[PDB]
Design a protein around this motif. Sequence first.
Motif, PDB file in Angstrom:
ATOM      1  N   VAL A  16      -4.997   9.408   4.453  1.00  8.51           N
ATOM      2  CA  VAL A  16      -4.104   9.242   3.289  1.00  8.51           C
ATOM      3  C   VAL A  16      -5.021   9.616   2.112  1.00  8.51           C
ATOM      4  O   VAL A  16      -5.919   8.822   1.759  1.00  8.51           O
ATOM      5  N   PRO A  17      -4.860  10.851   1.547  1.00  6.64           N
ATOM      6  CA  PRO A  17      -5.933  11.292   0.633  1.00  6.64           C
ATOM      7  C   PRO A  17      -5.995  10.513  -0.668  1.00  6.64           C
ATOM      8  O   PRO A  17      -7.095  10.267  -1.124  1.00  6.64           O
ATOM      9  N   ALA A  18      -4.849  10.157  -1.260  1.00  2.36           N
ATOM     10  CA  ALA A  18      -4.847   9.457  -2.570  1.00  2.36           C
ATOM     11  C   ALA A  18      -4.152   8.136  -2.332  1.00  2.36           C
ATOM     12  O   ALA A  18      -3.079   8.127  -1.750  1.00  2.36           O
ATOM     13  N   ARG A  19      -4.725   7.009  -2.773  1.00  2.05           N
ATOM     14  CA  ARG A  19      -4.252   5.704  -2.249  1.00  2.05           C
ATOM     15  C   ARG A  19      -4.010   4.693  -3.357  1.00  2.05           C
ATOM     16  O   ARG A  19      -4.767   4.644  -4.307  1.00  2.05           O
ATOM     17  N   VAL A  42       0.815  -1.211   0.000  1.00  2.00           N
ATOM     18  CA  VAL A  42       0.000   0.000   0.000  1.00  2.00           C
ATOM     19  C   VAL A  42       0.848   1.260   0.000  1.00  2.00           C
ATOM     20  O   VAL A  42       1.976   1.258   0.490  1.00  2.00           O
ATOM     21  N   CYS A  43       0.314   2.337  -0.532  1.00  2.00           N
ATOM     22  CA  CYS A  43       0.900   3.638  -0.180  1.00  2.00           C
ATOM     23  C   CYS A  43      -0.011   4.763  -0.529  1.00  2.00           C
ATOM     24  O   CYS A  43      -1.079   4.561  -1.119  1.00  2.00           O
ATOM     25  N   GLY A  44       0.343   5.960  -0.067  1.00  2.00           N
ATOM     26  CA  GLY A  44      -0.524   7.056  -0.404  1.00  2.00           C
ATOM     27  C   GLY A  44       0.225   8.376  -0.391  1.00  2.00           C
ATOM     28  O   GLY A  44       1.424   8.420  -0.118  1.00  2.00           O
ATOM     29  N   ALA A  45      -0.507   9.423  -0.709  1.00  2.00           N
ATOM     30  CA  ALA A  45       0.084  10.754  -0.848  1.00  2.00           C
ATOM     31  C   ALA A  45      -1.040  11.790  -0.721  1.00  2.00           C
ATOM     32  O   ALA A  45      -2.258  11.422  -0.734  1.00  2.00           O
TER      33      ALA A  45
END
Length: 371
Positions: free
Chosen positions: A50-53, A7-10
Amino acid sequence: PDHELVVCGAPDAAALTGLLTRVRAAATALSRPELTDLAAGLAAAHRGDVPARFAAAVRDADGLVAALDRALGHLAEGGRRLLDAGRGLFLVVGGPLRVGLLFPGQAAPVPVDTAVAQPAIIADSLAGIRWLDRLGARPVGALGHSLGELAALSWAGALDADDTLALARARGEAMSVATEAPSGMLSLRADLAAARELAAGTGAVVAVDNGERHVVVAGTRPELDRVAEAARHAGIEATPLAVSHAFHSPLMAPAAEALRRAAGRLPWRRPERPVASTVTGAWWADEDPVEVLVRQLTGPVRFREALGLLDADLLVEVGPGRMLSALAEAAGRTAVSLDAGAASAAGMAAGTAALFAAGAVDDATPFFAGR
């Protein structure tokens, strides 16, 4: 596990492109244990708001590189939403999305004796519910297909887990009793009106309304023979099911006395979360659970109608197997199964990825604990 969860986000799409590009660079030619460290570190760092995933369930570093290339291409084209359940890849900028749950019935992975199958399946679904609890999941509502309605009701807080599993044993015991005569079920690749036409005057009745091209009928062996004749004549494909009972038909009425007794003893509560019933084909609204559960034995499974009511961008099947995900995909919906209790972590990875990307869970770290 045989699949890793990455997973990650920005804070936004531009930032997410930057990050996914760094992760793709760091991912090339990683060994299996180094991929695990990478994925565990990303889960620790990308949790909360996490706004964008991005989330993907992958077999190895090259599977991650491939998923990142797809996500990057989608972003590069102005895309903000890519949900590919079949490839375990989910990307969402500007979520959360609405997520609904699907609880499977029998015919689900444990013909098996229904007395054993029922509580085994329910045990797997309740363990899936513990997983969603551990993650703080926030689905908009649930649907359970036949037996699965018991798990949906337990998720909704109408009955505790111990009582639910006790009810599933008693249910499986009541229902495994042999019908008065040889009986079974016949699956038709046709809609409800076509099945009712083929069944009209035969003695067979609609047992399961799964969708516009899957309806199952049930009856004694002579009754099903008459439908099978009619289906061949009309050019409708009719597939015998390997079951020994005409489930969801009046042949199940003797199981009612027993099931009414077992369920009448339990401390039922009002459901506190939405449940789309496959007994009523409506939202559950202060029904008497005992009466609903008894008529569920002889009445049809209204899965097509219930699914139609559950307004959700993504469905997660919470139970063993992926049968209800296959049905939801057959209705043009997006669905992925946790495959609760499977030997393989495939479904646990893909379904947790889907939850995280949709914004239904804030933290994937529990996937990396205690291996």
